[PDB]
Design a protein around this ligand. Structure first.
Ligand code: EOY
Ligand code: MG
Ligand code: ZN
Length: 341
């Protein structure tokens, strides 16, 4: 009855103005993880309203309220891949809309699909990666390993199962063509969140940025959607040092738990997943330099107003260098004991 009462309030109390959430809510400086989790479903509705999706697509309010709650409920509680991750990703999507004028690049339905996909893009994550599904012979690998992107195929299927739950299909009044289009977009966008996919299309993303975005080019729309999605997924890096440091802590707790499971199964975990080997500053510098920074550089190349995003990610990368020396124990530990040897 908890979800029941939550739904009742979401529906009958009305959608709070986005400004009432926080005065800097639509700024790139805002940290959505600062929002209490109990306020996040209402904030999703607020953002949807402010982007005019509810009016433009005549979304049924009861259905939308149920959908948002079901999506939130469809996340488990690992250290990083939980609802607060999906919420913050979705918030960054809203920030791109508010700050970068997406309507000059993308169709309305494409922006709508990007935001809905942000909400659903890690549904039912179990705190382990694609490699672990295959190594552990999980049910997800049995279903999808032959296709690849095992977890991302699962996330997308979970999103569809929510839509297919009675009372939850926010698109069910759509035309046949628009419905098919929306689900196709969600497939493409969610599958774009596999790092393997990003690596595959990276040269194409570069070539798009250098020749220039062509709104009449259907391939450019698809590539831009992939880039924007990956920008949202990594958007914790575009905030202050405190956010970056906290997210590293959640990510490596999640990783080392997987690593401990791999050790128990007799397998040699990835080094970044092995708490006995992993050197966090060097790992994060490598992630920032090889993955995060090139993505926000592409974003800047395509959207000059995204410059501050790249500069912040580069700044956070430099901070890891600055604090790395603190991972060396100098003098004695605080307890004046060398017992830990
Ligand atoms: C702060 C931070 N650090 C990270 C450090 C390492 C890795 C990570 O998975 N690295 C490897 C390890 C192995 C060898 C390489 C290929 C894969 C196996 C992944 C790199 C990811 C990190 N990460 C993510 C992240 C992003 C995801 O989707 C990414 C798409 C959307 C682009 C999926 C999962 C995560 Cl956890 N979000 N934030 C972070
Ligand atoms: Mg994912
Ligand atoms: Zn994610």
């Amino acid at each position: 009855s908890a979800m029941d009462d939550e739904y009742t309030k979401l529906l009958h109390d009305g959608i709070q103005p986005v400004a009432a959430i926080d005065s800097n809510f639509a700024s790139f400086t805002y940290t959505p993880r600062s929002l209490p989790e109990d306020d996040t479903s209402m904030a999703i509705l607020s953002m949807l309203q402010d982007m005019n999706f509810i009016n433009n697509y005549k979304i049924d309010c009861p259905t939308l309220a149920r959908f948002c709650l079901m999506v939130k409920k469809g996340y488990r509680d690992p250290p990083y891949h939980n609802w607060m991750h999906a919420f913050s990703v979705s918030h960054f999507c809203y920030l791109l809309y508010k700050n970068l004028e997406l309507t000059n690049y993308l169709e309305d339905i494409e922006i709508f699909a990007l935001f809905i996909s942000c909400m659903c893009h890690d549904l039912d994550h179990r705190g382990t990666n694609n490699s672990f599904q295959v190594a552990s012979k999980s049910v997800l690998a049995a279903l999808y390993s032959s296709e690849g992107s095992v977890m991302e195929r699962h996330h997308f299927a979970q999103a569809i199962a929510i839509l297919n739950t009675h009372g939850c299909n926010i698109f069910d009044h759509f035309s046949r063509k628009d419905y098919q289009r929306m689900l196709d977009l969600m497939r493409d966008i969610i599958l774009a969140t596999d790092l393997a996919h990003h690596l595959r299309i990276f040269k194409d993303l570069q070539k798009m940025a250098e020749v220039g975005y062509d709104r009449n080019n259907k391939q450019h729309h698809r590539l831009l959607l992939c880039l924007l999605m990956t920008s949202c997924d990594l958007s914790d890096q575009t905030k202050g040092w405190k956010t970056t440091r906290k997210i590293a802590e959640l990510i490596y707790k999640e990783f080392f738990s997987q690593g401990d499971l791999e050790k128990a199964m007799g397998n040699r975990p990835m080094e970044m997943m092995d708490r006995e080997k992993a050197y966090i500053p060097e790992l994060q510098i490598s992630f920032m330099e090889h993955i995060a920074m090139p993505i926000y550089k592409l974003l800047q190349d395509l959207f000059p107003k995204a410059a501050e995003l790249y500069e912040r990610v580069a700044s956070n990368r430099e901070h890891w260098t600055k604090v790395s020396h603190k991972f060396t124990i100098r003098g004695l530990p605080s307890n004046n004991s060398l017992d830990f040897l």
